[PDB]
C-alpha cells in the first residue's frame, strides 16, 4: 500500500522558516514525482511545485519564488518543503501527492500538514459540558454537547467516549475571535441510554500538549 506520511501541525512566528516532511513508502521513491499543493482556509488549491527524487529535478510555481524550496532524502524516502519569510498569507494546509505516472495526476495523497503563522501564544482549550437545562429536552432522543473555548492555534480533535461513540455526532468548524478559537460538538443519543450509559467528550489539543475529558452529567 502506497502511503505518504506528513509531519505534524506547526505554529511558527512570521519572518521565520519552517520545513515540513512527506515520508513515502509502498513504492520506488526515486521513480515518481511528488508534488505539493497549498489550501488556505475556505479556499481552493494552489500548486507549489513537483520534485523527482531519482535525479532530483524540480518544477516550481514561480509565484513562490524565494518562498519555497523542495528537497528529497533518498536514503529515507522522504520529501521536504521549506517555506521562508513567513507571513499569515502562508497559513494553510499543505498536501504532498504522488504522480501516478506519465501525466496521470496525483493518485496518492498525504493527510496534509497545517501551518499557522502567528505572533499569538499557544493557549490550551477550556472545555465546558452542555447538558439538558431548564426544558425537558425531547424524550425519545436527547442531545448533549461540549463547548471548546479560548484555544490557539488550530486544530483540536473531538471524540466521544474515546471514539466508541460516533453516530449522531456533529463537531462544528472552529471560529476565530480576539486571537482565540471556539468550537462546539453535539451528540444525540437514545433517551433510555442516558445517563445510564455515560457520555464523555474528549478534546485533544496537540499544540499545547493538552487533552481534557468532560463527562456530561444531568
Amino acid at each position: 500500500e502506497v502511503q505518504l506520511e506528513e509531519s505534524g501541525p506547526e505554529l511558527v512566528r512570521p519572518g521565520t522558516s519552517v520545513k515540513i516532511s512527506c515520508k513515502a513508502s509502498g513504492y520506488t521513491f526515486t521513480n515518481y514525482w511528488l508534488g505539493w499543493v497549498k489550501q488556505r482556509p475556505g479556499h481552493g488549491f494552489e500548486w507549489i511545485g513537483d520534485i523527482y527524487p531519482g535525479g532530483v529535478y524540480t518544477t516550481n510555481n514561480e509565484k513562490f519564488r524565494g518562498k519555497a524550496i523542495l528537497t528529497a532524502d533518498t536514503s529515507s524516502s522522504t520529501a521536504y518543503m521549506q517555506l521562508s519569510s513567513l507571513t499569515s498569507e502562508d497559513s494553510a494546509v499543505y498536501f504532498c501527492a504522488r504522480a501516478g505516472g506519465y501525466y496521470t495526476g496525483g493518485d496518492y495523497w498525504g493527510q496534509g500538514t497545517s501551518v499557522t503563522v502567528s505572533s499569538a501564544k499557544t493557549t490550551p482549550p477550556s472545555v465546558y459540558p452542555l447538558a439538558p437545562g431548564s426544558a425537558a429536552q425531547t424524550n425519545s432522543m436527547v442531545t448533549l454537547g461540549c463547548l471548546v473555548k479560548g484555544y490557539f492555534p488550530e486544530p483540536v480533535t473531538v471524540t466521544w467516549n474515546s471514539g466508541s461513540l460516533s453516530s449522531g455526532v456533529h463537531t462544528f468548524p472552529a471560529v476565530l475571535q480576539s486571537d482565540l478559537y471556539t468550537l462546539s460538538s453535539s451528540v444525540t443519543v437514545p433517551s433510555s441510554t442516558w445517563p445510564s450509559e455515560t457520555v464523555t467528550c474528549n478534546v485533544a489539543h496537540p499544540a499545547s500538549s493538552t487533552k481534557v475529558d468532560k463527562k456530561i452529567v444531568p
Binding site: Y103, D107, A131, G133, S186, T188
Partner: protein, 217 residues
C-alpha cells in the same frame, strides 16, 4: 496563467440521478504530443483530495465507474451516472499543461432530499464557565434541509446580535442534512442581569420560527 472556470455550485441533485459538472479552460489543454492535460479531483469535508479523472477521460484507479469525463480539449465535463449521498463535496478541474499548474475554483455538489425541520436544543452556561466570569449560551440546530436558515437571539425579549458566533457543517454524507451551532457569548456580569434567553430559527418548514428558551432561575 491558465484560468479554469467552474460554477461555485450545482443545482441540488436527486439521489440516484445523473449529474454533470463542467469546466472551461482559457486555452486548449491538448499537447502537440496528443495528450490532454486535464484532471478532475474531489475533496470531501476534512479529507485530502482524491483523483477521479486524468487526461480528461481516463478513470483513475480507486475511483468508482459511476464517474466519467469528456471534453473538447477546451471545454470539459465530469459526469456521475448515479449520484450517491457520499458523493457530496467539492469537485475541481486542474491543468498541468503549462506552468504554473492551476486549479479551477471548485464546484460543490449538493444532494436534494426531503425537507426536514431542525431539531433545536438550547443550553445555559455551565457552572465552570461562570466561575471564570464568562457566560456562553449554546444553541444547536441539527439535521435540517434545505440549508437556508436564520437564527435570532433574544434576551428578555429583545434581539441581541452582538457576541453571536455561528458555525455550520457541510452536507452530511449519510442523511444529506445540514447542522448549525450558534453561541451567544456574554460576561457573567451581563448574563446575571437578565432572565430569559431565547434561540429562534426561521426555516422554510414552518411559518413561525422554531423557538427554544430558558429562564436563568
Amino acid at each position: 496563467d491558465i484560468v479554469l472556470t467552474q460554477a461555485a455550485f450545482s443545482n441540488p441533485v436527486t439521489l440516484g440521478a445523473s449529474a454533470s459538472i463542467s469546466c472551461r479552460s482559457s486555452k486548449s489543454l491538448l499537447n502537440s504530443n496528443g495528450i490532454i492535460h486535464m484532471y478532475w479531483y474531489l475533496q470531501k469535508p476534512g479529507q485530502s483530495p482524491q483523483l477521479l479523472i486524468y487526461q480528461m477521460s481516463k478513470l483513475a484507479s480507486g475511483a468508482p465507474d459511476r464517474f466519467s469525463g469528456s471534453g473538447s480539449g477546451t471545454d470539459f465535463t465530469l459526469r456521475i451516472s448515479r449520484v450517491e449521498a457520499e458523493d457530496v463535496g467539492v469537485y475541481y478541474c486542474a491543468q498541468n499543461l503549462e506552468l504554473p499548474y492551476t486549479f479551477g475554483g471548485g464546484t460543490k455538489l449538493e444532494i436534494k432530499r426531503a425537507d426536514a425541520a431542525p431539531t433545536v436544543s438550547i443550553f445555559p452556561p455551565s457552572s465552570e464557565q461562570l466561575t471564570s466570569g464568562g457566560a456562553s449560551v449554546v444553541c444547536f440546530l441539527n439535521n435540517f434541509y434545505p440549508k437556508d436558515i436564520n437564527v435570532k437571539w433574544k434576551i428578555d425579549g429583545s434581539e441581541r446580535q452582538n457576541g453571536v458566533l455561528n458555525s455550520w457543517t457541510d452536507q452530511d454524507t449519510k442523511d444529506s442534512t445540514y447542522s448549525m451551532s450558534s453561541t451567544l457569548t456574554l460576561t457573567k456580569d451581563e448574563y446575571e442581569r437578565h432572565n430569559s434567553y431565547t434561540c429562534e430559527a426561521t426555516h422554510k418548514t414552518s411559518t413561525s420560527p422554531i423557538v427554544k428558551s430558558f429562564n436563568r432561575n
